[PDB]
Scaffold this active site. Structure first.
Site, short mmCIF file in Angstrom:
data_model
loop_
_atom_site.label_atom_id
_atom_site.label_comp_id
_atom_site.label_asym_id
_atom_site.label_seq_id
_atom_site.Cartn_x
_atom_site.Cartn_y
_atom_site.Cartn_z
N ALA A 196 0.83 -1.19 0.00
CA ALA A 196 0.00 0.00 0.00
C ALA A 196 0.87 1.25 0.00
O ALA A 196 2.03 1.22 0.40
CB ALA A 196 -0.91 0.02 1.23
N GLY A 236 1.18 13.98 6.93
CA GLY A 236 -0.04 13.75 7.67
C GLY A 236 -0.24 14.82 8.73
O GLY A 236 0.67 15.59 9.05
N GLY A 263 -0.89 15.58 12.61
CA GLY A 263 -0.84 15.09 13.97
C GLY A 263 -2.00 15.60 14.81
O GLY A 263 -2.55 16.67 14.55
N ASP A 306 -2.74 11.16 11.84
CA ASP A 306 -2.10 10.37 12.87
C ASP A 306 -2.85 10.53 14.18
O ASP A 306 -3.00 11.65 14.69
CB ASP A 306 -0.65 10.79 13.08
CG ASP A 306 0.03 9.91 14.11
OD1 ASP A 306 0.38 8.77 13.76
OD2 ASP A 306 0.17 10.34 15.29
N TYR A 310 -4.54 9.78 23.12
CA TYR A 310 -4.73 11.22 22.93
C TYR A 310 -6.12 11.68 23.36
O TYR A 310 -6.34 12.88 23.50
CB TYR A 310 -4.47 11.62 21.47
CG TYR A 310 -3.07 11.31 20.96
CD1 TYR A 310 -2.02 11.01 21.82
CD2 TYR A 310 -2.81 11.31 19.59
CE1 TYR A 310 -0.76 10.69 21.33
CE2 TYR A 310 -1.55 11.00 19.10
CZ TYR A 310 -0.54 10.67 19.96
OH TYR A 310 0.69 10.33 19.44
N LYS A 361 -2.76 3.82 17.22
CA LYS A 361 -1.71 3.20 18.01
C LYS A 361 -2.33 2.52 19.22
O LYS A 361 -3.22 3.06 19.89
CB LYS A 361 -0.65 4.22 18.47
CG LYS A 361 -0.28 5.23 17.40
CD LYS A 361 0.89 6.11 17.80
CE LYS A 361 1.09 7.28 16.87
NZ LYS A 361 0.11 8.37 17.08
N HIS A 388 2.37 1.57 20.20
CA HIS A 388 2.69 2.98 20.45
C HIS A 388 4.07 3.14 21.08
O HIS A 388 4.84 4.04 20.70
CB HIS A 388 1.60 3.59 21.33
CG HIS A 388 1.51 5.07 21.30
ND1 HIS A 388 0.31 5.72 21.52
CD2 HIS A 388 2.45 6.02 21.10
CE1 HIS A 388 0.55 7.02 21.48
NE2 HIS A 388 1.84 7.23 21.22
#
Ligand SMILES: NC(=O)c1ccc[n+]([C@@H]2O[C@H](COP(=O)([O-])OP(=O)(O)OC[C@H]3O[C@@H](n4cnc5c(N)ncnc54)[C@H](OP(=O)(O)O)[C@@H]3O)[C@@H](O)[C@H]2O)c1
Ligand SMILES: O=C(O)COc1cc(F)ccc1C(=O)NCc1cccc(C(=O)O)c1
Length: 316
Positions: free
Chosen positions: A11, A17, A19, A44, A49, A78, A111
């Protein structure tokens, strides 16, 4: 330059990207919406988070609006440290999928190599104040990640904050089924990572650079810490190219064949940070930026330095 890099699962992954660590839940939906509107196709994320639900609202709406198709997006999350046990991995992935409104992730990362005791607390403590490890090892956690590929939950699996010996442990795992696609590590002019990057690239593992701007909003910042965005030497390179310092800091990893994931919730900066495909740093610029290395980490993990799998004792 080309917008995507080919992974070892076949892929393609967008090299730029958005964050989302520290993006407030009341601002991240609009941040992700703006990002998609201005061309971002890679977000991401992480369960730790605490804002995946709000990221997902943005994704789902832009899909509903037909601003993008799902196959054009590259969504990364993650597995947090308290979910390394084999019986918890699927549920952790499925909670992230539910929150993000997705049927699959494009990439799911371990992670950190350090597993922690499961439970409600993301950092379970004993003094005494030490984080309580789990007796999980990276190889069994990796096998659980491989299962997720074989169940269709994730297209690719990878690792984050793994040092070169830990990457090597995965690559040498007995019965390894899927090699990591990505190692996501901190990388910027103050932590240039030459050794770990060349090792990963030599094995066909793509490296993603996190905290590329030096994470000025990190919660533990001190006034005496070095500041990439304010470094006169970097500002001078930006001025020469008629770009912002942030744009130089984003272009830098791109020219090392890295993926890069700058975070912003500010609409004008989200747009600015994407306008990095129209200029080139010279080899001399690149070597000059590399020369600023000082082995300085945004994410040093000082509370984990006794964990058997702490990644940052090794040189790299
Ligand atoms: N795998 C891991 O262990 C790990 C660890 C750390 C980070 N990451 C990932 O990497 C992402 C990026 O790292 P990060 O969040 O630590 O920090 P970063 O991207 O280096 O810096 C983000 C900070 O820079 C500001 N900023 C963004 N664009 C700017 C611009 N053009 N001009 C000036 N300031 C600008 C942001 O402000 P505003 O938002 O207010 O605009 C925010 O304060 C994270 O969000 C997360 O997705 C992963
Ligand atoms: O980790 C990230 O993506 C960005 O930092 C965080 C974000 C959070 F929401 C909550 C905690 C952190 C954090 O402390 N990270 C550092 C960390 C974590 C786990 C183990 C180690 C270690 O050294 O083993 C190091």
């Amino acid at each position: 330059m080309a917008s995507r890099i080919l992974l070892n699962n076949g892929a393609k992954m967008p090299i730029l990207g958005l964050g989302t660590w520290k993006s407030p839940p009341g601002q991240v939906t609009e941040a992700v919406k703006v990002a998609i509107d201005v061309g971002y196709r890679h977000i991401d994320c992480a369960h730790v988070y605490q804002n995946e639900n709000e990221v997902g609202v943005a994704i789902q709406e832009k899909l509903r609006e037909q601003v993008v198709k799902r196959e054009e997006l590259f969504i990364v999350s993650k597995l947090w440290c308290t979910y390394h046990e084999k019986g918890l991995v699927k549920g952790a992935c499925q909670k992230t999928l539910s929150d993000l409104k997705l049927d699959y992730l494009d990439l799911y990362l371990i992670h950190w190599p350090t597993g922690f005791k499961p439970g409600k607390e993301f950092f379970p403590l004993d003094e005494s104040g030490n984080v309580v490890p789990s007796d999980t090892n990276i190889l069994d956690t990796w096998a659980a990640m491989e299962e997720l590929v074989d169940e269709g939950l994730v297209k690719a699996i990878g690792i984050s904050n793994f040092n070169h010996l830990q990457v090597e442990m995965i690559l040498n795992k007995p019965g390894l089924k899927y090699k990591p696609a990505v190692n996501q590590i901190e990388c910027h002019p103050y932590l240039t990572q030459e050794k770990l990057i060349q090792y990963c690239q030599s094995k066909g593992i793509v490296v993603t650079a996190y905290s590329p701007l030096g994470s000025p909003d990190r919660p533990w910042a001190k006034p005496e810490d070095p500041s990439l965005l304010e470094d006169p030497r970097i500002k001078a390179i930006a001025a020469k190219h008629n770009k912002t310092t942030a744009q130089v800091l984003i272009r830098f990893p791109m020219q090392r064949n890295l993926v890069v994931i700058p975070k912003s919730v500010t609409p004008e900066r989200i747009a600015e940070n994407f306008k990095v495909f129209d200029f080139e740093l010279s080899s001399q610029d690149m070597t000059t930026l590399l020369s600023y290395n000082r082995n300085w980490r945004v994410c040093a993990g000082l509370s984990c330095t006794s964990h058997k799998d702490y990644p940052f004792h090794e040189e790299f």
